């Protein structure tokens, strides 16, 4: 489909239904040790190393209009992250997918955030032999879709800053391609953005290149060509979809080092994430990005990204059995 | 007191009593939302941001022979960490101390690990206003004292490596003076040490200086003078005690940049932490440190550190009301 | 003495004399292999490794009103730099000083820049044994005093930027306490400043701290206290003099890490260098520093720094034998 | 042609002729301000900013058996380097090539090192307007071919270390794709290698990846595939030739991040540079690389690289007019 008005109008209709629901799972549901629990009642062991040392990876696919979006790509990224961390998925994929679809169906949520967390488990790495660290724990939950930029704001764009008081954790400390919850730097960025009268922090690599922000990748558009950092960042599924969309809409996209100066020269800027989709930035460091309006290439990408949510290649329909 | 044999003999006697205990709190006790729970049964909310984004600081004081060691120094460090993170202790100090002493007394544990965790709470920073982030959560627990180096090994020293596949998260990403559970780099170090046939990883700053390791600070001893990194590291309470001990035993200690080459030139090497105390390193990168035996200055520090546990200035006695 | 008007008026009088001189050495004189040459005619061997690989250290003391300022401090810093580089001064100190004073006297220059360069010599390090690298070369020259900020501008202050396209070479690559001519980053900073409509670049360490700029150290003044970076920078003789001046004028000065945010919060900012002295900064990133006027503590330091040029403790008089 | 014995035998014959030459240019010739001078007599102005602030780029093509090797690739790299530095070639390309060929012919040198240096000139960047910095200086010289690894050693391989006391200057300080003479870190590496009983330092990026060394790129060979760092390094013409050679000999080569651990796992290691060609490394950190012998893929590359020196696509013949 894909115009802003159409995509958001459908969401608003579905949200109206969900907000009126008497289902105790309408606010979300968690899977904890084989049992489904309302999300706000869910609890995990204090001694889980996902809490004790954030010793975990995670991933967040999504459901849009009752259709899982690029689920296999998320599951493959999670499996790759687990392998890099010497973790292993505690359930085989068919059981993971059956469980997730059951949770979503039970909740009635049509536009959902769908998180999976794999932790080291109850035995810490420090002082253990490798064979003592194989009993890894899985937590999964769904909740209503979350917006890093609200729909109304996507029409006019948001306010970003290039963070100056913090830089991204370097890959030689923590590999940013391993999706993780060690957000110390990203939280510093969020506070700095708020202190500076903005919402979205763009972090550098401490070597004068752009990386990513607090829950999103960044794409610059300059003289008809798209640019996004290669290193120092999560290889986002939304970013992958932007690369797909650029090729399909017929634009060049370059995944390479992006010197931070390029941010100040950009014709258009957008953020991309599962938690909100395609999120234009129209003010940077208190100055407008070009004319301060959402750009034409941004809009082409926006439309294509959303159109993909109803295509077989990128999505599948959940049966809500209602 | 302070000889290895004496200190460890007392611990073994107290451990023998604890291991025979029928008290359901002998394996530890947690405080969760005002209620005491056996440690292995304790659970926290899934949505706590201490789990969802490791958005927390913590601290770990200890009890030795029924005496809290440097509790105020730990509580002041935790309060300073909270302030740096824009967190606040959810209970006033008198209530914190009363609760901790009650937990320890109830458990009967004489040699204890005593952890306090302050998290952002149930509302995430991303998308919040600062005034929405003030309802911070506190978790506290005690467990039997944990050894990063077992007593028997402290007689002969351990095996370390200088990590080559990972470096410490830089302070411009996460301030290492804020004690935290974002251990991605330290866990990489632990796996690298195990892969290389060692136990203790020393991480560099990625600029050819020594920092700290996975749960400890590092001190080098060279030509009668002690050296420990100033930047890039937690300002350990054990390290503070080593500085106190050095001054009292009459040695110079220098808290300054320590180029990594110094590790290879050291006369003695020790690690220091609340979880084990003073832990000699006698093999580095598969080669002996000097003669490969625990050094004389290390032993002087070891003895003084433990002697401090029975001095008023540094400790207070808990009434177990038994 | 020390008011701006008085100090600059004396310089202008002496400059008027020098500008009228018919002495062929009035524009400067070089010492090359034991011979004095007019500066603009001086030549060095192409194969000198100071040119072939910038394999050198240098230092620049100065003469003010016919008085060498802190010459021994410069010579001791040069000797320390040589030792760090495994170079050695090719002439003993008495011969160095006799030669420099003779050059200055011969030139008639009363306000002089006085440079010494020690290079590896004609044999490169690559492919040599250490004993083949001991024949180091010395070049010395004097020229009329050079202003990084012109006298008239010192009344109102200059325009700085925090560089965003470059960061300072880290000490684990090149030790910035070794004064050196490998200015690749500082030249990038200069071009960035010019591109951004400013004159003075302040470089960060790539970890969100202030370092130094292109030929100067940086001092911030905040709530009556002075602050200057400890690491990542040359330990300037002017900076040393500012520390002396602060203590004498009775202010606290802290030589420690300076987060870059502090630059944006400063009450006053100044740059310091032998090539110009004490140089106020009153615009930063296109915004005024406080009221955009030269601050009171800056002026106290300015006056004291210049007063030192006529004190025995810090200077000696050259006999021009005229 | 291309076997070691054949290639080196031809060089030895030509060297025998050159060593007997009575030509005053047989030891090299420099071009300085339009005049040819014997290399050991050549001198440059002291005030040239190539000396005063190493404010220059350079390049070093070569002549082998009287044939210039990949001259245009070197000249294009030099032109790109100049553009990045806001320098410009002071002579048009036809004059550069005519001059270089004349110098080589006059010298009689058949196997030559051929250096070009472009400096900022006599006006320093600091304190200048951009339009005052356009009078750039050119120096060119030829000298007999220089070996970073002597021919006899290439049969058995050399000794390398991974540097631990220094790391490569990061690209956000100085762009390593701009060939430059600011060798502070590389000289530290050379001294560290010598201190550790080795000849060749491999520097990391300070983030646990391999970069390059003191005058060479590094290629690892693992399970039939070649690997060489993408970032942090000069894009060597020899490296380009190795990429060409790998494709022609039919091997995969990957130009990507190379974690430093890979060096310790490699089947074969080689260094590559114009100053010596293809230089096997058979000892790393005092341990043999696999069997400690020169590997089969290294030999295939070695042969192909040298074969290219007699092919039209990659070389042209100089007329010595003898
Ligand atoms: C650091 C970072 N970088 C990039 C992205 C975008 O990645 P995807 O295009 O694959 O979503 C993210 C997004 N991470 C993310 C996505 C959806 C939900 C949540 C949540 O837990 O609130 C987090 C992120 O956290
Ligand atoms: C990174 C790091 N650095 C230094 C220390 C030593 O700090 P103290 O001297 O203040 O203890 C630590 C120690 N951190 C620590 C101490 C005691 C117990 C536990 C645990 O949770 O297992 C962790 C640490 O984790
Ligand atoms: C990088 C850097 N940092 C600090 C200073 C100030 O140091 P002193 O306070 O010791 O001068 C410098 C100054 N370096 C300097 C000083 C005087 C003349 C020249 C020249 O060669 O033009 C260079 C410098 O080049
Ligand atoms: C840092 C660095 N990296 C890689 C190379 C290899 O680049 P080429 O494959 O393009 O040559 C170099 C080599 N640089 C080089 C090459 C030839 C001679 C000289 C000299 O001046 O002694 C220096 C170098 O100095």
Residue numbers in the entry:
A (entry chain A), B (entry chain A), C (entry chain A), D (entry chain A): 1 to 322
What do the authors of the reporting publication say about this deposited model?
The Nectria TAm belongs to the fold-type IV class of PLP-dependent enzymes and is built up of two domains of α/β type. The active site is formed by residues from both the N-terminal and the PLP binding domains of one subunit of the Nectria TAm and the N-terminal domain from the adjacent subunit. Thus the relative positioning of the small restrictive pocket and the large pocket gives the enzyme its (R)-enantioselectivity towards ω-amines.
In order to analyse the active site binding pockets adjacent to the cofactor the Nectria TAm was co-crystallized with the inhibitor gabaculine, which forms the mCPP adduct with PLP in the enzyme active site. Gabaculine binds to the TAm enzyme to form a Schiff base with the PLP cofactor. The gabaculine complex crystals contain only one subunit of TAm, with two subunits of the molecular dimer related by the crystallographic dyad. The carboxyl group of the mCPP adduct is disordered due to its clash with Phe113, which is also partially displaced to a different, strained conformer not observed in the native Nectria TAm structure. To explain this enantioselectivity of the Nectria TAm the mCPP complex was used as a template to manually position the (R)-MBA-PLP external aldimine adduct in the active site for catalysis.
